[PDB]
Amino acid sequence: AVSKVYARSVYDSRGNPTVEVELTTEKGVFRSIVPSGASTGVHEALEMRDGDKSKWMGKGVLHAVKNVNDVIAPAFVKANIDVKDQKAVDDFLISLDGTANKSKLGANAILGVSLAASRAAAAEKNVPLYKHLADLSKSKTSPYVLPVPFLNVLNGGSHAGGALALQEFMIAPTGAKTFAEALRIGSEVYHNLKSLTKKRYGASAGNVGDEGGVAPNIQTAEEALDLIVDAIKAAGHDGKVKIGLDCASSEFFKDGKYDLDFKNPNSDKSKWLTGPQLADLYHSLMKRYPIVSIEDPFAEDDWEAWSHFFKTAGIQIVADDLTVTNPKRIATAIEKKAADALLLAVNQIGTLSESIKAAQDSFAAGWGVMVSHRSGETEDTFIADLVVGLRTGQIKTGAPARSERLAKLNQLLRIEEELGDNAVFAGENFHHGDKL
Amino acid sequence: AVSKVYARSVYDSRGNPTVEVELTTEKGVFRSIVPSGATGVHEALEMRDGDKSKWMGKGVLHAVKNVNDVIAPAFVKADIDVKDQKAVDDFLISLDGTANKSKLGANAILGVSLAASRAAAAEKDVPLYKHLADLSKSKTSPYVLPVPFLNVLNGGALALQEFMIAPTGAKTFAEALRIGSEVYHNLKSLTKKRYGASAGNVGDEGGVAPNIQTAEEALDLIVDAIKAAGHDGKVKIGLDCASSEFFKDGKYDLDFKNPNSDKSKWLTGPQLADLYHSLMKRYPIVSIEDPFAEDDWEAWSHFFKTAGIQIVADDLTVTNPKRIATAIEKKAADALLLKVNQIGTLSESIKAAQDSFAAGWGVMVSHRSGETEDTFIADLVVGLRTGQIKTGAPARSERLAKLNQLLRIEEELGDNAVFAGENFHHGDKL
Numbered sequence: 001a002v003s004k005v006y007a008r009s010v011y012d013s014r015g016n017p018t019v020e021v022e023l024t025t026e027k028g029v030f031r032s033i034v035p036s037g038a039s040t041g042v043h044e045a046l047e048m049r050d051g052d053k054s055k056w057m058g059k060g061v062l063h064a065v066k067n068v069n070d071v072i073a074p075a076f077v078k079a080n081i082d083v084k085d086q087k088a089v090d091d092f093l094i095s096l097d098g099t100a101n102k103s104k105l106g107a108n109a110i111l112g113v114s115l116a117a118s119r120a121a122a123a124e125k126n127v128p129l130y131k132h133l134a135d136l137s138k139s140k141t142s143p144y145v146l147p148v149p150f151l152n153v154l155n156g157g158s159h160a161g162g163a164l165a166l167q168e169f170m171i172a173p174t175g176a177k178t179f180a181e182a183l184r185i186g187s188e189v190y191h192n193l194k195s196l197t198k199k200r201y202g203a204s205a206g207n208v209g210d211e212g213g214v215a216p217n218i219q220t221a222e223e224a225l226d227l228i229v230d231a232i233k234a235a236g237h238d239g240k241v242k243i244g245l246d247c248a249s250s251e252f253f254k255d256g257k258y259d260l261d262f263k264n265p266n267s268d269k270s271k272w273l274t275g276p277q278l279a280d281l282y283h284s285l286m287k288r289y290p291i292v293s294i295e296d297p298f299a300e301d302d303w304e305a306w307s308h309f310f311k312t313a314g315i316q317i318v319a320d321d322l323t324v325t326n327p328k329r330i331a332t333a334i335e336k337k338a339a340d341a342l343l344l345a346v347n348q349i350g351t352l353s354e355s356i357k358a359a360q361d362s363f364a365a366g367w368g369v370m371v372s373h374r375s376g377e378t379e380d381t382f383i384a385d386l387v388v389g390l391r392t393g394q395i396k397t398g399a400p401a402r403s404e405r406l407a408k409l410n411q412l413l414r415i416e417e418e419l420g421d422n423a424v425f426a427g428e429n430f431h432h433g434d435k436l
Numbered sequence: 437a438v439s440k441v442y443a444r445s446v447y448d449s450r451g452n453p454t455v456e457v458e459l460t461t462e463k464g465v466f467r468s469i470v471p472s473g474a475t476g477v478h479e480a481l482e483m484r485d486g487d488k489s490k491w492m493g494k495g496v497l498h499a500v501k502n503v504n505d506v507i508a509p510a511f512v513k514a515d516i517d518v519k520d521q522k523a524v525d526d527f528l529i530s531l532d533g534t535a536n537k538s539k540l541g542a543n544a545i546l547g548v549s550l551a552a553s554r555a556a557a558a559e560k561d562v563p564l565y566k567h568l569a570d571l572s573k574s575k576t577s578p579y580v581l582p583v584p585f586l587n588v589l590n591g592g593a594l595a596l597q598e599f600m601i602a603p604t605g606a607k608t609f610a611e612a613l614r615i616g617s618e619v620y621h622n623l624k625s626l627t628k629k630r631y632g633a634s635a636g637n638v639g640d641e642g643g644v645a646p647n648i649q650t651a652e653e654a655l656d657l658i659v660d661a662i663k664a665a666g667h668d669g670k671v672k673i674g675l676d677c678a679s680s681e682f683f684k685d686g687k688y689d690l691d692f693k694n695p696n697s698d699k700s701k702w703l704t705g706p707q708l709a710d711l712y713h714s715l716m717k718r719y720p721i722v723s724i725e726d727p728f729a730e731d732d733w734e735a736w737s738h739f740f741k742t743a744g745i746q747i748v749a750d751d752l753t754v755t756n757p758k759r760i761a762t763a764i765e766k767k768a769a770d771a772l773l774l775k776v777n778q779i780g781t782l783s784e785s786i787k788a789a790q791d792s793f794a795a796g797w798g799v800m801v802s803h804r805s806g807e808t809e810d811t812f813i814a815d816l817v818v819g820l821r822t823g824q825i826k827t828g829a830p831a832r833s834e835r836l837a838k839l840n841q842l843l844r845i846e847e848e849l850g851d852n853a854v855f856a857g858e859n860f861h862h863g864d865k866l
């Protein structure tokens with residue numbers, strides 16, 4: 001029985017308020033925290049903010065919290081839905097709000113209750129969270145599949161001060177044999193990268209972006225990718241570490257064009273690229289560097305550019321702002337063959353149930369699924385258990401720096417240990433990890 | 437009954453491996469993680485593998501092994517009562533058998549020490565901070581909630597390492613944190629405006645690190661930030677000089693990042709003190725940590741004569757009751773920076789705090805620069821009733837995890853807690 005549901009304000013990794021929910025049963029008190037994006041897709045479910053300029057830079061979540069405590073809480077406690085029944089739980093919450101985009105209560109009011117319920121269920125059942133999430137998703141547990149970590153070791157775009165347009169430069173130790181090995185290798189590459197970055201672009205280059213990657217003030221990707229390929233070599237993990245990009249191209253899509261200097265107020269509109277032109281630059285990058293995944297190469301509604309690029313890409317193409325973990329928009333992307341991987345970000349859609357549906361739909365269409373953090377993260381570790389539960393074989397939860405990232409990576413360490421011989425490391429099979 | 441003690445490697449906020457310990461009883465499995473400094477020469481031994489081919493030489497396999505291979509079987513055989521933190525840490529301390537914990541390693545022992553206290557709280561069915569109050573014979577009516585010292589700016593051209601803000605003017609911790617976060621964001625905005633976008637990217641502790649020449653420029657910047665946020669008069673400043681970092685040939689080099697620093701312009705103890713006093717006169721500074729080197733006793737004592745604000749010992753005392761006794765003897769400082777992993781056990785850490793308090797000292801509980809998702813010090817600072825803590829800027833969740841835990845503690849305690857505010861120095865005496 002759910003005796004209590006309670007929400008408070010806490011702080012994310014950028015020092016902005018966000019919603020924390022506590023769900024009390026006889027099994028104890030269960031806590032989930034909602035993350036917060038910076039490069040948020042326009043189609044994402046509502047993140048409700050106070051916009052009281054006198055408090056928290058206008059970023060209060062008092063209203064969201066109040067919606068939990070004054071609206072959802074009493075109705076949820078009164079109903080006492082079986083927490084084990086995630087569908088009915090999320091069913092209830094979504095109906096309480098009664099809008100498509102969760103704009104009545106706010107996604108950041110509902111998600112906390114959704115996630116906390118699933119934690120409570122796992123306890124009731126006497127099973128690890130990833131196990132219960134496996135159950136929820138009807139995923140195979142024999143073996144489990146452990147994810148390749150995609151480590152955003154070099155931050156640009158809206159995640160770091162500097163010229164670099166593309167948002168995330170990730171390394172993916174697919175050549176590793178275990179997660180633990182992959183994390184060691186990733187940390188070694190990161191440290192070697194940090195040293196080379198300082199030497200190459202100055203000590204200040206070694207300071208980190210929002211997601212823990214070094215933040216050199218450089219103008220082009222090709223400059224970023226040189227640093228990483230040099231770092232991989234220096235760490236002596238050549239051929240065992242691939243690269244992944246999040247372009248977050250929606251952040252510099254303007255006037256049907258793409259601004260590769262969008263953080264320059266004096267950017268040259270002459271040198272803004274067309275879809276084609278941009279497609280060209282990517283293909284050059286793909287040719288020169290060991291890139292195995294590219295996320296949001298084109299804009300959240302630039303469907304034609306996705307379709308045309310995907311035709312001849314030949315690597316994993318991840319939809320993020322395109323699909324915003326929305327089963328509706330995933331259906332479109334599948335139809336148009338715009339991508340073959342989904343970025344799963346639970347607070348984009350606002351319930352676990354909906355997030356699991358998006359995953360299941362993607363897998364069914366032969367997509368991959370990369371579970372993701374937000375750039376605004378917390379000490380919450382839910383997506384570590386999620387990626388394992390969902391058997392996706394790939395996650396991206398930050399550089400190996402800043403503990404809102406390490407928290408997830410550490411939790412994955414612990415899960416791999418627990419699972420022992422009943423887990424495989426997805427490694428080179430990350431794309432179709434579920435099919436393993 | 438403790439039925440297993442176990443250790444694994446995990447990664448700290450800088451992506452370096454560290455020791456995580458799990459202690460198992462009939463109440464379940466209880467977890468503690470060891471932090472890591474970037475360290476006083478007198479600190480208990482942090483044991484690293486030094487295998488250049490692994491983790492940049494920073495592996496902790498040996499320490500983990502020491503937990504699993506040496507401490508673990510003996511501890512279990514010992515049938516220790518985790519409720520008795522003293523018996524716990526005496527066993528551990530005895531097992532290692534060395535003054536500075538160099539046989540098994542400080543980072544092997546501390547995890548067991550902390551996990552035991554978590555297990556003890558559970559057995560008693562009390563919150564951790566409550567158990568820690570009991571262990572330390574601290575008053576709980578009311579509890580005292582800490583002022584957060586937030587590390588918003590870092591140095592080290594400008595030679596001073598840490599520049600913190602302390603919302604002592606707040607009426608609750610919750611209000612303190614909000615005010616702190618607002619100042620921090622305003623400072624970040626001003627920094628990028630004044631020193632370029634890249635200068636907004638954070639350091640190891642989540643603070644900004646603009647290329648600044650002088651302390652004054654760093655303090656003026658912070659003053660502007662506090663004003664911009666509209667909290668002028670409600671927010672004070674704290675400093676961590678980490679002067680050992682620029683202590684050379686019996687002198688202090690304020691320009692110790694310049695290879696050709698004018699050696700003739702290196703300061704004497706009395707000279708540096710003159711600088712601090714000028715800074716202290718012009719800015720709302722209410723606390724200064726390690727203003728002199730970790731064995732420059734004469735320099736501390738001299739300064740302490742004329743200083744009118746809290747003077748914290750860190751590298752000087754390294755949370756060691758033996759060195760704190762000296763510091764008290766010499767009238768070198770009047771506050772202890774409590775870093776549990778500097779001495780290695782909870783019991784010695786509590787002993788250090790108690791010796792400090794008994795000598796009229798303050799105690800600032802503190803993180804290390806390499807932190808984890810572990811939130812022990814949040815419960816510890818409340819348990820010890822010290823009234824002040826420093827656990828990072830309000831960014832990076834190895835910092836926020838602690839400050840969030842304090843929000844929860846404050847909410848839980850309701851009317852049975854006071855915010856130390858202006859009275860942080862003698863918070864324990866509140």
Ligand SMILES: O=C(O)[C@@H](CO)OP(=O)(O)O
Pocket residue numbers: 036037038039040041211246248320343372373374375376
């Ligand atoms: O774009 C992304 O993929 C996410 C995760 O890194 O970032 P943000 O939460 O800022 O949108």
Ligand SMILES: O=C(O)[C@@H](CO)OP(=O)(O)O
Pocket residue numbers: 472473474475476676678750802803804805806
């Ligand atoms: O000197 C200090 O005060 C500590 C905490 O800031 O730093 P470090 O853990 O690197 O010793």
Ligand SMILES: [Cl-]
Pocket residue numbers: 793795796797862865
């Ligand atoms: Cl006193």
Ligand SMILES: [K+]
Pocket residue numbers: 529530531532533
């Ligand atoms: K002994």
Ligand SMILES: [Mg+2]
Pocket residue numbers: 037038039040041248
């Ligand atoms: Mg985004």
Ligand SMILES: [Mg+2]
Pocket residue numbers: 246248295296320321343
């Ligand atoms: Mg993205």
Ligand SMILES: [Mg+2]
Pocket residue numbers: 473474475476751
């Ligand atoms: Mg130090």
Ligand SMILES: [Mg+2]
Pocket residue numbers: 676678725726750751773
């Ligand atoms: Mg210090």
